[model samples]
Target: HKSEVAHRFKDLGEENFKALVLIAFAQYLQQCPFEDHVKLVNEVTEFAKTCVADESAENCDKSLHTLFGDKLCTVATLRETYGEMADCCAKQEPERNECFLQHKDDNPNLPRLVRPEVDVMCTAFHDNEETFLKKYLYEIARRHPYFYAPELLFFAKRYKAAFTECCQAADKAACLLPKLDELRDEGKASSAKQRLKCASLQKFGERAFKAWAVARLSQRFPKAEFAEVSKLVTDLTKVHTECCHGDLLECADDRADLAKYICENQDSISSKLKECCEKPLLEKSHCIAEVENDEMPADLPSLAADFVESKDVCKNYAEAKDVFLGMFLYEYARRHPDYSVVLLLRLAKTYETTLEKCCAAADPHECYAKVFDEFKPLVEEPQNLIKQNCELFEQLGEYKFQNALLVRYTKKVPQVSTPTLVEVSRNLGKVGSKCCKHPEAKRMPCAEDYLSVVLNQLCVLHEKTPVSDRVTKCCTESLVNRRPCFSALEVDETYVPKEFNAETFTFHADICTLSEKERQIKKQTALVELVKHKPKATKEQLKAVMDDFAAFVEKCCDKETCFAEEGKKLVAASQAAL
Candidate 1:
């Protein structure tokens, strides 16, 4: 009960009809008699301009002969798979290939050319081109973070062409914008991920290509200094920016010209580098550092953009504080470079006090100038208190110091800005006043824990006992001495004891000087601070090393500490001047 599809073939026109019939017969097709099919095929071939009328036989199944014969000819392999009805072809395209061979083939749709799998793969590959293109481009961008833009620069036109070709079956933005399901929003009608993806690719492509082009330019000069190569980078980027506005084709076109430009202007670029690298010492040092770097610092706009977004932090501090800090610190740097960190700390503290005094002034500028003038007198003496303290401990025995010395020194010391140091100085004064004035009947109560001086200031001492601040007292040796110090009544009585005992005081030397382990910590600080002045060591680097040392001491210095490995790292870093 098979109905003939012969009349359906009439819509195909004669040329296609003849080729279909000729290919179908050849004894591979068995539904109809060969002799009758030949006549029907020749009748159509008469109207057809081109025909492959001659046929061949092979020792094979008739259906496979239509497919296996190379002479049948194929693009998408329709004749290779089917030999009727204008021969729909199934061609395989690539996702991540400009190659051929074998591996653990990931695409189930496009299995490797095994004889058994071949027939299905043609249709399978054809069906999945869009999916393949998307996955490939997404992988290109995702796997190689820095190089994709430039690598895409090389593949420029072809990538787009391949992408477009995949869209023949289904046009989609999902190709390069894979993993965008998360970016999709049910609230919005538009495809958010597509726009984001397009922009992301374009943006990173620019950066990556810029890196690539610079790297290639650097390759031209064997003995090129970073200053020299980096100058060429700016030049190349300028040209790249002007020539291409995210046009991959334009970028591809100019790669050769860009290389030539760098080559031709080597001397000019060198001179520019000389100009930049010989400017101010700070700028020159930064320029040299940038040249040695694998990646350049982001342009100022990127750093600025993020700060602008976090404007809530600005609400807490006065706007004028920044103005005072920036302007005052600029002049402060020229006058004193070594103590910038110390002064910067104090300057921040000064701003808080000045908030109402100067910042709220009617003549704000004049008020700030007055505050600035007040601080200027102290700036001339740039001495570290830590170093001085260590030296003093070295010179004078710890127990010999008097309360008067501590109180006097506290008064003389420049106003400390940090709370930790301020409290330390205050408590040191308290300890000195209490201990140095010890052994007298008029000694003040010792600040709780008198063991480690660091501990005593922090120790909790409530004015009230657990029961009450107004607890009754019990005394020995007499009925009068055994009076109940009234709870409510004691506050009324303002009680005084009849007798007092003289307690002798002794100062432990360890409280004044660092212990055996703390001595090692002091050693690390000294090492870090010692190299702080070295040309190779940045202030930040010295701070980092000292920070790491401090952290190590805090965590590990209780029992045993070996700074040998950490010290080695510092030594190695010392060579870099970081």
Candidate 2:
């Protein structure tokens, strides 16, 4: 056995080669009784250690066969399921464990074993609990070769506990069945959380993910040193890098190890972290993942310190921009956990662009000193706009909030087409819909990105139309300043509508026959027309008119005789308000 394994993994050297074999052997040992299992594991480890020291494959082979003369069949079964373990020997030691963990045979051709009825399972458990549990471990270990040893062990222990309790119950099926569903659901939720972490890793990129992790860890352990928090981030990044790339078993193993490491040192970390570590294995992971960041420390330093204190800004920036920016992000994020990773990245990017331009100038120091002074407002203004918009979204709900945007933007840029205005408002409304519901930490960045796209679209439209001085000036500003410029503008009070034609407000009973979608379109069209006719109408007046129109539709839609009179009343009310 040693000779065959050595020949297949010649490049693995002694240490890694032994590890691969031992890992496979450990899987095989899952089927044995606890007494024999512990004895076998010690013997296997000793065999590998002696074999490496004595420089003899013959002794290793003899020891293996002697130790598991009849149980070699179990080892052979493991070889069939985990045959690809040998292939992982090609990887370096640092990555070998992950590579080994990923080589499980997920062959679709393998037949799935149907679980026996509850009565049969309970009867088997009663006959020989150890044998039944060992068999359970063996089946699961073979079936889900991708599961880490700890994961499978925990799963088996949980199953054993459930079955033990259920077998003693009056109704075993009733007791055990729901517990099975709970286990399955727990597994699914755990899997989903892992997938979400991977998705976040992909969406945010490694640099931002690292920054986020650092920020979160630092916030959670506010009393810990930066170096201590950084070490935790390092371990976390490795797990995400492997897991997001599909090495789930390795991910789980590393994550479990991290949880243990944190809990063991819980005194140095935050007490809040202790709460999560106290949970069961699966729930513990979920708890840690959902842990909220701590409030920003009172003494947190400004991001400007890095650049302002530097003797040669360009030299520092050019040397390692990634390191410089990453450090900046880590500092910035930890101090402001309410800001999302996306917003942190945007600020980083803005700083980078400013650094590049300043570094190229004749006097870099002067430019660096002035960087934040100019940059601060540019970042804050747009952030405030997004926050305020999101607040309105949450306060007003979707329809009223969107109508508010339509009325406001239309009044600000009256020369712009009604359809174009409506489209921009709808898109911004979607930004509110998608972003406002995110956690406070994530909401700003989500809104910032989607809001930028919507504004940029309007900017593009304005390039051709040049609707007004304010619109043109906003579109002409730098990308960072553009949204703020638009946000700062007030109603276009100088513009005058041709006339208020009451005929435009006339409603028919047939209008009630429109589909919901068509009805929405008609209402939006009416809003645009109303705003165009009375461009000077205050937002409250416009909203009130819309409200009155909605009530008119609700009350008179089914009554043919009521439409004209109600429509006339709405027209008079709207005209009176304007």
Candidate 3:
């Protein structure tokens, strides 16, 4: 019982069919909500696009639409079973939705439409958004990996990012940073399991988002400063990936400089001085024994800062100080009220003990000398060596200037510069050569002992310098090339027989000329001088490849290895003339 109109329209084009289907879809969706309408429109579009491909081109354009049509259309016929279940829940979902709208914040025990668990509800919402986006995006990507590849790539990154973010946020709850106690009290977390899971998810999501952001930026701005770019990351990251996109981790030193500028303008920092007590101390123990008065506020920042700095002083000198920081903390803690004098004295004593102990113990001396050398180069010449102990002792505030009489009483060697050492050596040499008539003119063993000291130290410096010269060693190793064995020149087969008259005379060149079937013993001399040895270039560059040295050599015979590096270049220009 076909209608005459239907039979008359049998040859209708795809445009009319698409139009009819679209109109029917439009009419069906007119009865539903906007979101449902959107979903229905997607379904209609999908159905129309299905099998609408031009397979005549031979390349199957398996776009998202193509894939979705193929995959979903096959399943649509079976969707009736799903429809039954959907229908059953459709009415229930509406009522539940109504319940949600009515008591979004009202009822606690009725088991609201949303899951009671924050994680579960968040997960449900995120999963729905995620699946919808995946379909939306994959359809886009499948269609436009080339055309809209940028958008697809962008959205693909985003889609993946969103799902991961949701997983992390629902799992970790990074939203409540610096407020762990609040989450625990809210019953959102019990026994810390949720919190731990949430934290893990948050960290994972954070890393993923950061990576995506970096990739996106690099795609846009390659060769930009990575530190500055990485620092471009939003500070307060959340499920939505709220970007700070600016300098949110404001520098403290900026404020300090501001205060300094103000002070330079003659603005009284008296207020700042009094406010100094409230300054953030890296550690509170810095003000432990300070006078409990106005004086305390003014000096706290300085003492704590100096105290903090002193903590690092002994780190390099750890052997001399039991624990580097412990020494500083012990001293700083002991003299807080009048910290200056006592603290200096304590430091002086520690330095003195360190100097003596460093000289006493062999292991300690080696350790201290290593650290000491980090500060100053080891002395080479004898004069600098003699004065080295004296200079550092004076620098350490261990000894002060006194009379020459006092120097002699202490048995200290007389002061000697290079000029003075040379003069004394001249006199001593004169005495040794009997040039000095007076016996008292040059009796000193000054130059001999001085030379002995110099040689001993030179040996030490020479031995240690080589062992620790990684920075300079980079210089030497940078020049050499690492090549494979096959790169060597092979004349064995290459030299074998070019003019063999096998077809003409039915004989070989050298071996066939003999015609006695003398197996011509060919020798391969390729390895010895296969490569061009350029003594002018560094050893490293010589071993590397050059562009001209192709497998079939039309170029000068220097070395084949020089051709290795120009690999791709040769490959591209190959067979140009042929």
Best by lDDT: 2
CA RMSD for every model?
A: 30.3, 14.1, 31.9
lDDT agreement of model 3 with the native: 0.29
Candidate 1 vs candidate 2, TM-score winner = 2
| Sliding window of 10 residues with minimal summed lDDT for model 3 | 478-487
Model 3 residue 64 CA deviation (Å) reads 21
Cα lDDT computed for each candidate against the true fold: 0.34, 0.65, 0.29
CA deviation > 4 Å runs, candidate 1? 1-324, 348-356, 362-369, 376-387, 393-578
Candidate 3: list runs displaced more than 4 Å. Answer: 1-236, 240-548, 551-578
Scored against the true structure, residue 167 in model 1 reaches a CA lDDT of 39
C-alpha lDDT of residue 175 in model 3: 45
Question: Which 10 consecutive residues of model 1 have the lowest summed lDDT?
Answer: 95-104
Deviation of model 3 at 548, angstroms: 5.9
Clashing residue pairs in candidate 2 are none
Strongest candidate by TM-score = 2
**lDDT tens string, model 1, 1-578?**
01112222343445334433443332222222334445645554542222222122222222222222222232233343334421311222231111111111222232222222322423443677543333333333322222213332223234545344443434243442231222211111122222222333355555433443333433233244555555655656654563333322244335545444543554543333444443422123223322421222223122122222233223334664443333333333322223323333454345446655654557555554445454554443223332343355445444323222322322222121123223443445445444433432112112211213232122212112222232212211111111111101221122221121111111122222567545533343234223322324344755675566456444433232234444445445544554
